[PDB]
């Protein structure tokens, strides 16, 4: 059963997931938008916003302790400094999602995960 459990396995074990999420986190910062499988985006949503919350507040500590949550200088450099004023314009909700249907390798519904404050 999974009654009031949340968190998908996805592909593999948690040990794949934490690498796989850290990649996609940084890729989000790095390039703005990501097109991927619809379940995947709606799972990565849950746990990348916590980088974004830590980063709309100025802290030196929480940056280094927020590098316990990421790795890569660049993305915690973009966060805070460049995606800080992006996300100082609100609390709550740091992506819009929207969707895009099946994939051409096999039929698998895809969605989007992308920043909402630049996406124009």
């Amino acid at each position: 059963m999974r009654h009031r459990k949340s968190g998908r396995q996805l592909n593999r074990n948690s040990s794949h997931r934490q690498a796989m999420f850290r990649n996609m986190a940084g890729s989000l910062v790095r390039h703005e938008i990501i097109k991927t499988t619809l379940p995947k985006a709606k799972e990565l949503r849950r746990v990348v916003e916590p980088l974004i919350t830590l980063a709309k507040t100025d802290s030196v500590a929480n940056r280094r302790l927020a590098f316990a949550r990421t790795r890569d200088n660049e993305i915690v450099a973009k966060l805070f400094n460049e995606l800080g004023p992006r996300f100082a314009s609100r609390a709550g909700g740091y992506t819009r999602i929207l969707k895009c249907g099946f994939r051409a390798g096999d039929n698998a519904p895809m969605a989007y995960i992308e920043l909402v404050d630049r996406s124009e």
Binding site: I33, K35, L98, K99, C100, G101, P109, Y112, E114, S119
Partner: protein, 56 residues
């Protein structure tokens, strides 16, 4: 197990009753995109309700 006996043609088409793809009536129109597009997804020019998501 390993079956016995030969199923009849009937018995095939009887399972294939339930086999088919759902007719979604896929085409649909927005006032933000009059395209002939599948609803709740891309219009093929990025829109969903307007707003281009695509850069490719």
């Amino acid at each position: 197990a390993v079956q016995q006996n030969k199923p009849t043609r009937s018995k095939r088409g009887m399972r294939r009753s339930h086999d088919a793809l759902t007719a979604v009536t896929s085409l649909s129109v927005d006032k933000t995109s009059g395209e002939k597009h599948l609803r709740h997804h891309i219009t093929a020019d990025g829109y969903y309700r307007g707003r281009k998501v695509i850069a490719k």
